[PDB]
Amino acid sequence: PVRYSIPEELDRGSVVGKLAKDLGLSVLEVSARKLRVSAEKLHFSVDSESGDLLVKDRIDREQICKGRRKCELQLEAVLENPLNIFHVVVEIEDVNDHAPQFPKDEINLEISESDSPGARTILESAKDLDIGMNSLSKYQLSPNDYFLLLVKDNPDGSKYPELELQKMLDREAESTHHLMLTAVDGGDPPRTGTTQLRIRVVDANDNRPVFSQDVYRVRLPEDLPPGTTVLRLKAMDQDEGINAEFTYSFLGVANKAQFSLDPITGDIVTRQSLDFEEVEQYTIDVEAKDRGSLSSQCKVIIEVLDENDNRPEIIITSLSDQISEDSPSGTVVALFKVRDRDSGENAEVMCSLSGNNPFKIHSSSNNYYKLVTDSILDREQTPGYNVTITATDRGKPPLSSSTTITLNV
The footprint of ligand NAG (CB under 6 A) covers 384, 386, 406
Q: In Å, what is the CA distance from 273 to each residue of 189, 227, 254, 267?
A: 88, 9, 17, 17
Q: Per-residue DSSP letters for 16-62? A: EE-HHHHHT--HHHHHHTT-EEE-SS--EEE-TTT--EEE-S---HH
Amino acid in position 141: L
Q: Does the annotation place 144 within a ligand binding site?
A: no
Quick one: which of 10, 14, 187 has its CA closest to 98?
187
Q: Does the annotation place 57 within a ligand binding site?
A: no
> Which residues does residue 37 pair with via DSSP β-bridges, in sequence order?
77
User: Among Ca ion, ligand NAG, its own copies, none, what binds residue 384 when CB lies within 5 to 8 Å by partner kind?
Assistant: ligand NAG
Please, which residue, 140 or 327, has the CB nearer to ligand MAN? 140
Among 182, 195, 310, 373, binds Ca ion (CB under 5 A): 310
Q: How many residues bind ligand MAN (CB under 6 A)?
A: 18
Whole-number Å distance between alpha carbons of 193 and 102? 7
Residue 64-103 contact track with ligand MAN, rule CB under 6 A, x = bound: ----------------------------------------
403 is an interface residue for ligand MAN by CB under 6 A: no
Q: What number of other Cβ atoms are within 10 A of residue 293's Cβ?
A: 8
Residue 224-263 contact track with ligand MAN, rule CB under 6 A, x = bound: -----x--------------------------------x-
Residues 6+ apart with CB under 8 A from 126: 100, 101, 102, 136, 139, 159, 160, 161, 183, 193, 195
Q: In Å, what is the CA distance from 228 to each residue of 232, 258, 379?
A: 12, 12, 63
User: Among its own copies, ligand NAG, Ca ion, none, what binds residue 370 when CB lies within 5 to 8 Å by partner kind?
Assistant: its own copies
Residues in 208-247 that interact with Ca ion by CB under 5 A: 222, 237, 239, 243
Residues 6+ apart with CB under 8 A from 128: 98, 99, 100, 101, 134, 135, 136, 183, 185, 193
Buried b (16+ CB within 10 A) or exposed e, 71-84: bebebebebeeeee
Residues in 236-295 that interact with its own copies by CB under 8 A: 251-255, 281, 283, 285, 287, 289, 292-295
CB of residue 132 to Ca ion, shortest distance in Å: 9
Among 337, 343, 350, 361, binds its own copies (CB under 8 A): 337
Q: In Å, what is the CA distance from 266 to each residue of 89, 247, 252, 286?
A: 86, 7, 15, 10
Residues 6+ apart with CB under 8 A from 278: none
CB of residue 386 to Ca ion, shortest distance in Å: 26
CB of residue 150 to ligand MAN, shortest distance in Å: 17
Quick one: which of 296, 203, 214, 287 has its CA closest to 244?
203
CB of residue 218 to its own copies, shortest distance in Å: 12
322 is an interface residue for its own copies by CB under 8 A: no
Please, which residue, 121 or 357, has the CB nearer to its own copies? 121
- Using the rule CB under 8 A, give the single segment among 5-13, 24-32, 258-266, 333-341 that binds its own copies: 333-341
CB of residue 194 to Ca ion, shortest distance in Å: 14
Among 7, 186, 190, 252, binds ligand MAN (CB under 6 A): 190
Q: 3-state class of 205 per DSSP?
A: coil
- Using the rule CB under 8 A, give the single segment among 45-53, 110-118, 264-272, 306-314 that binds its own copies: 110-118
Q: Does the annotation place 81 within a ligand binding site?
A: no
127 is an interface residue for its own copies by CB under 8 A: no
Whole-number Å distance between alpha carbons of 139 and 125? 10
Whole-number Å distance between alpha carbons of 329 and 357? 14
Buried b (16+ CB within 10 A) or exposed e, 397-406: eebebeeebe
Annotated binding-site members: 8-9, 60, 62, 94-98, 113, 128, 130, 134, 170, 172, 185, 203-207, 222, 237, 239, 243, 275, 277, 290, 306-310, 325, 340, 342, 346, 378, 380, 393
Annotated binding-site members for Ca(2+): 8-9, 60, 62, 94-98, 113, 128, 130, 134, 170, 172, 185, 203-207, 222, 237, 239, 243, 275, 277, 290, 306-310, 325, 340, 342, 346, 378, 380, 393
